Amino acid sequence: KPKLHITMFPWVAIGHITPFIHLANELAKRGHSISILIPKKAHTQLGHNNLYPDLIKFHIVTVPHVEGLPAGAETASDIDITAKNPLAIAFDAMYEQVETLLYGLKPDIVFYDFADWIPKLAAQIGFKTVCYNVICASCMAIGIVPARHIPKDRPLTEEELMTPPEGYPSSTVVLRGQEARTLSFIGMDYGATKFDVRITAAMQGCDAIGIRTCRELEGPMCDYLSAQYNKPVFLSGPVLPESPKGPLEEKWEKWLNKFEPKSVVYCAFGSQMILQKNQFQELVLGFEMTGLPFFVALSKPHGADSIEEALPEGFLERVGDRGVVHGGWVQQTQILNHQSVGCFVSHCGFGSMWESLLSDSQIVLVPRLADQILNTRLLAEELKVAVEVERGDMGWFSKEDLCKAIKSVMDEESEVGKLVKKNHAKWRETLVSPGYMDNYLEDFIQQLYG
Numbered sequence: 001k002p003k004l005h006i007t008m009f010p011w012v013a014i015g016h017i018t019p020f021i022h023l024a025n026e027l028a029k030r031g032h033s034i035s036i037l038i039p040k041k042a043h044t045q046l047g048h049n050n051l052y053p054d055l056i057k058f059h060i061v062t063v064p065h066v067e068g069l070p071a072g073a074e075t076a077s078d079i080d081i082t083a084k085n086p087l088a089i090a091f092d093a094m095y096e097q098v099e100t101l102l103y104g105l106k107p108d109i110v111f112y113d114f115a116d117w118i119p120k121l122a123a124q125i126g127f128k129t130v131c132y133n134v135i136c137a138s139c140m141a142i143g144i145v146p147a148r149h150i151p152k153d154r155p156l157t158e159e160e161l162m163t164p165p166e167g168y169p170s171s172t173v174v175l176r177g178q179e180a181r182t183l184s185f186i187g188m189d190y191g192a193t194k195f196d197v198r199i200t201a202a203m204q205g206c207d208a209i210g211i212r213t214c215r216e217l218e219g220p221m222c223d224y225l226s227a228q229y230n231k232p233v234f235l236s237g238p239v240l241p242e243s244p245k246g247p248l249e250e251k252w253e254k255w256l257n258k259f260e261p262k263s264v265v266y267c268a269f270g271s272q273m274i275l276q277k278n279q280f281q282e283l284v285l286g287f288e289m290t291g292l293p294f295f296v297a298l299s300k301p302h303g304a305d306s307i308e309e310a311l312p313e314g315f316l317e318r319v320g321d322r323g324v325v326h327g328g329w330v331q332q333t334q335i336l337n338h339q340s341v342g343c344f345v346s347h348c349g350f351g352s353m354w355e356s357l358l359s360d361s362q363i364v365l366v367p368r369l370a371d372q373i374l375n376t377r378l379l380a381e382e383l384k385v386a387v388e389v390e391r392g393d394m395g396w397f398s399k400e401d402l403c404k405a406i407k408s409v410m411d412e413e414s415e416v417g418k419l420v421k422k423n424h425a426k427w428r429e430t431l432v433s434p435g436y437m438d439n440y441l442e443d444f445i446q447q448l449y450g
């Protein structure tokens with residue numbers, strides 16, 4: 001079998017481009033040739049991530065200026081929400097530049113997600129298409145699917161959004177109440193068209209749908225998506241990047257070593273979230289209330305000079321050496337692997353969820369976004385490997401709610417903790433079994449050949 005030539009054209013955001021590159025590295029490792037079309041600024045930021053320079057080539061695509069687009073705006077990270085429709089309109093405008101590159105590259109398969117016009121080019125240039133999604137399967141299945149009717153004229157109510165589309169496999173992986181607002185984007189404008197129109201065209205135009213998940217986690221959701229669009233669904237596995245080697249920072253190791261094994265509660269909310277000052281103070285107070293050792297790695301609240309400035313009065317003093325609150329970036333994998341760490345409080349982002357699943361720590365979830373809430377419902381309610389902190393109307397969580405969730409997984413007495421620990425242990429063993437990740441990548445490649 002001759003090796004494949006795959007072209008990737010992701011939506012212009014670091015959160016989309018990076019998983020596409022990680023998949024490209026796994027494909028190149030197998031000998032396949034990848035051409036990746038991205039703006040230069042993303043190229044400058046992520047270019048070091050290419051581990052196979054002869055197999056993986058970057059092609060710079062220019063983001064055309066359009067009315068309302070800030071100067072030199074190329075990715076979602078450059079603009080805030082007011083520029084979102086200009087950025088999408090500019091993204092659609094690289095169609096002609098993409099067409100010329102595709103006419104030259106002549107790929108066998110093109111990967112895309114938000115560029116719904118790629119299948120039209122698939123007809124003109126002659127290539128197969130996969131609509132490959134970095135978002136979780138349950139979010140796709142509960143949202144933009146033909147079984148859900150989204151009116152063009154009027155927005156969906158909170159009720160319509162909370163109601164899962166007919167045939168949706170799970171009664172557990174659902175949004176509840178005010179959480180439904182987190183799904184409201186599926187109906188919003190996105191450039192010249194509404195988001196759901198763009199995703200519907202993307203899903204229906206492709207030859208197959210690609211999802212970065214595994215069947216053991218999200219199998220019924222993938223089957224629902226396959227039937228809803230009458231498309232095959234190819235599961236790539238999570239395609240997790242290689243763990244960063246190198247030792248843990250010596251001061252962290254020394255501070256962790258003062259504590260007993262599995263006794264330290266670690267907390268981090270990803271590299272995208274910045275908490276408001278009032279939620280931040282409520283969180284650090286919730287960790288103090290537990291009386292257990294804690295390591296909190298969170299960005300300082302926006303507009304705070306320092307972490308110590310943002311802290312509530314008297315916090316530093318009451319806590320002493322029992323807890324650390326650190327504004328800097330930390331080596332999350334190494335800290336979690338440290339014997340002293342016993343609990344992980346996270347927002348259930350994609351990276352943190354898989355790191356939680358693969359680790360030996362207890363799992364405490366404080367989701368914010370719609371996908372995080374759904375992954376939390378999968379982990380806490382269906383799989384029962386985690387506990388979810390109770391939250392308020394805006395996603396607000398009280399210090400007592402956070403404290404109770406931590407004690408419920410940390411106390412040896414707690415029956416809830418023993419159950420999630422046991423269920424967690426089963427799943428960890430499945431996901432770490434040797435060759436489990438590689439089987440998905442190999443099976444992904446074979447489906448591409450079909």
Ligand SMILES: C[C@@H]1O[C@@H](OC[C@H]2O[C@@H](OCCc3ccc(O)c(O)c3)[C@H](O)[C@@H](O)[C@@H]2OC(=O)/C=C/c2ccc(O)c(O)c2)[C@H](O)[C@H](O)[C@H]1O
Nearest residue numbers: 013076079080081084135139140141143144185199369370
């Ligand atoms: C602010 C974002 O706006 C919605 O997300 C919609 C999309 O928005 C994009 O951002 C580019 C525009 C932008 C740039 C800077 C900002 O400060 C800002 O607020 C908005 C992101 O890059 C996409 O990952 C995101 O897709 C998705 O996340 C969902 C994709 C999806 C969802 C359901 C489906 O069925 C499906 O096929 C795909 C949701 O509210 C997200 O939670 C939230 O992070």
Ligand SMILES: O=c1ccn([C@@H]2O[C@H](COP(=O)(O)OP(=O)(O)O)[C@@H](O)[C@H]2O)c(=O)[nH]1
Nearest residue numbers: 268270271272297329330332349350351352
């Ligand atoms: O202090 C930190 C915070 C985050 N991460 C890493 O950042 C990645 C992205 O986090 P996640 O996907 O969970 O959330 P997101 O950043 O996507 O919002 C994960 O692999 C974490 O290990 C890290 O190394 N140190």
